[PDB]
Symmetry: C4
Subunit: 256 residues, 4 copies
Amino acid sequence: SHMSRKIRDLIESKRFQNVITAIIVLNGAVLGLLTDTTLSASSQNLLERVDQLCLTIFIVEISLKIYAYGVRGFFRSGWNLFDFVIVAIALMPRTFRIFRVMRLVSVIPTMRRVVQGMLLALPGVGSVAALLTVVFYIAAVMATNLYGATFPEWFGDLSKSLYTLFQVMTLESWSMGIVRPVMNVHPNAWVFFIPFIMLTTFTVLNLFIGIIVDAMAITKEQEEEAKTGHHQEPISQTLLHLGDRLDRIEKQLAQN
Amino acid sequence: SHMSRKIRDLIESKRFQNVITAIIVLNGAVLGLLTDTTLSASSQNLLERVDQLCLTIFIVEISLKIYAYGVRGFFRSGWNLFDFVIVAIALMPRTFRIFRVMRLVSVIPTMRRVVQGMLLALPGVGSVAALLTVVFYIAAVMATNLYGATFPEWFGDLSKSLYTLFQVMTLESWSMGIVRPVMNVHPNAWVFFIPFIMLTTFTVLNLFIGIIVDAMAITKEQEEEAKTGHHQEPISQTLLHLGDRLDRIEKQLAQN
Amino acid sequence: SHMSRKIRDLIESKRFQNVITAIIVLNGAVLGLLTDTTLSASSQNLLERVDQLCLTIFIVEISLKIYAYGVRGFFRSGWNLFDFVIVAIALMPRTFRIFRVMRLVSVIPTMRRVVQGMLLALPGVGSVAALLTVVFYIAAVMATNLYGATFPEWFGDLSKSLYTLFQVMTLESWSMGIVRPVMNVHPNAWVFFIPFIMLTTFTVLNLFIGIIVDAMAITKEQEEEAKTGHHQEPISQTLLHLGDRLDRIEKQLAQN
Amino acid sequence: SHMSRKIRDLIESKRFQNVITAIIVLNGAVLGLLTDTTLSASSQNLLERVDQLCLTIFIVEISLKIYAYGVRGFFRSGWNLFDFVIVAIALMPRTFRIFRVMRLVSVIPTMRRVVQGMLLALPGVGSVAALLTVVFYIAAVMATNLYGATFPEWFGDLSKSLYTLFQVMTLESWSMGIVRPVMNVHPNAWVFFIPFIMLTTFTVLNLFIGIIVDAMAITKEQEEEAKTGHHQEPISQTLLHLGDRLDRIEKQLAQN
Ligand code: NA
Ligand code: NA
Ligand code: NA
């Protein structure tokens, strides 16, 4: 309808986006002020009302989107569902209201494209992430059996071992705090910890670089399609089209 | 034979892979439960029997593979030999039973391709890895002679020096824990430690990046061959084929 | 005019650049000597006069540039404005005189091209930098509310939380110094800190790699234009020109 | 001459290289044994004679090379000069005899090519390395003036400041050990240290990545020339040759 189209044109405008962005910033700003324990009862009540006002605007915003697009229809987009879930959860009296500042990502298209490039890059690194999970699980079992009776605060159970192996992987006090004390009791403990550090720091870097390279390439195409209407074809496809042109030229030549 | 082909078709199926994967997970799960020191005698005996059941399945699995393929023949693949070695070692009554969770890598083709890309990338970085080994050995000898008499816990012998130089390379308490105390006795010790850190962190990063770049390219070809039957030709070869087509066109033209 | 052209040719020469570079180095050298608290009154007065001499040369240098180019005109370049701002601020009797050693960057063209490649690369990473800012802000609010009453030195207010979350992101004593003590009171604190470390170290690396890749490509073009007069065309444009040549050949052929 | 050619063919052989490599390893092995303080007088005297034997072989090796190639002539190669300098310095009775294990690099061609790729990559990163030097110098002067009177062990002079800023850049105890104690006296010290960490870790990574990318590409060409006799032409040159072929085809066509 004409009314549905007039609302969709209003929602899709730059001015509507700037209003919603400003209210997300305002809501984020009042929640950060609400962390201040020294505030008076009146100052806290005022900020709580400003938070209530920001939330009511988001309910009106989402409701306008459900009418202008539909109920099949708005919910067909993961970014709208995320925006709905975040505002609908606040209407049910969890505790972490500051998570609605994540809406900046969904409302700003350039930020939205960066995050969807990272999410689309995750399937392609799943095998590397599973290999890291396997290495961590094997190492956690070994460390519990080897050092749990002598160092129970760090290796007393599987949970404790997973925690201190994550610490060891991040190279945080790994030697002065963990392995030099462990070696005072188990002199050959370096045989376990030095290869564990070599393997996990390498795997983590591999996983991170895999995400960065894919996400950069994916975002580069999404940004191109959002501006021009399409993306740049790969060099291999351009060389195939050039090769097909050479085949068409050779076919037209030598005969007819 | 018809029986050998029916077994090979069963082994190569997706359902057989999912059964073996589930039993590896189950075995890994019971071994992690066996780390719990608070367990009763009955609970431990039950898990030990479940571990025995998982192992007997793997013996039947490997035996089925030796019949369906051969004895020259199954052992012609490094992934089958690895699977054989890991299950045959358990039948000899070492201590680290959790290493059979590494079978997930050999059983899942996507994980198998990630690991073989990393292993195939190792020869190409051997010279960088040897340079790191040389720098570490030279530095360990120097540090033993320079600081061993005054700091014997850290540099008393070659083994102690290799250990604390690995710690220094990982930047773990390098200054507050090692070099500021060493400098209280040897004021110019920074002349040794700051270039050592500059050289080794650089070489380690070079080695790691070398593996990541090669492994990514190698896996990209192995994944392509496993799905399509072949891999994408390099841009230089495509440009050579295009160049050869231009030579064939020029030869057919100007004369005949 | 002939005088204006003779000054511009003097300014643009290699010898004038080497004189200005030497005076920047000299000024930097005397300021580093002025950090020495053990210096006599005469030694300090001498260095203060040498600093005064270096500054008067820069005033003459800038004044020569304003005459040889203009007042619209010299100030049309960001590198000249930076050079003007840095010398004009010294004539107003802030405290950090050593910031004029940054002039080496503006005076040496190779260093100037490296820095402008980094600055030109910043817009393209703005969305990633904003995502990091959002994650840090959300995390700072959460950490203040969760741990501020029990750990006020680290999380007592928003400012304190932003500081210790930056420390946590850099992996500095994150576990032995912050999270193991926090977990003694809040056993599930790892649920907050381990994903925060995973997200921020990843985002920081993404931001840094984004700057490095773009800056390298941008500098590579600026260095080419400064030497040859132009830069290398992209492979996609070269393939488009080759494709356009094949279209012109096919059009000239088959007819006329 | 026939004798000079027979020696050059002996020097250039694989067997001569394997003998020299074995003696370098042997020399390195005895020097590592000489770090052992518990050794008897006879055991030490024996190893000292083995070290003397290894050195005499190197003198004969270098002397054979000076005859087979010349005196203009052997010294025309940086790798021969390095080999000469390292063996000639031992004949003058400095202290660090283990530096002759660096000869492995010069004797093994694959290791030699890795190191020359790194050295050839250094000029191209000189501007980034100078920018890091400038930032470190400015920061060292600022930190001496700001914190030297209150924290003289860390910032008492320029040398002390350069040392603890290098520590801060490596993120080693930067907060718990340096900046939290400094902030107890100077509450706004984070304004200096957090941007310093942001700038230097970024610049170091930029410098390291710049070396890794260039060194990889340079070694890839040197390895190709050492095996095939030449290196692979860039994609831009191949596209220029293809473009030149299209120009020659178009010129031969439409007329004659
Ligand atoms: Na650290
Ligand atoms: Na670190
Ligand atoms: Na640390």
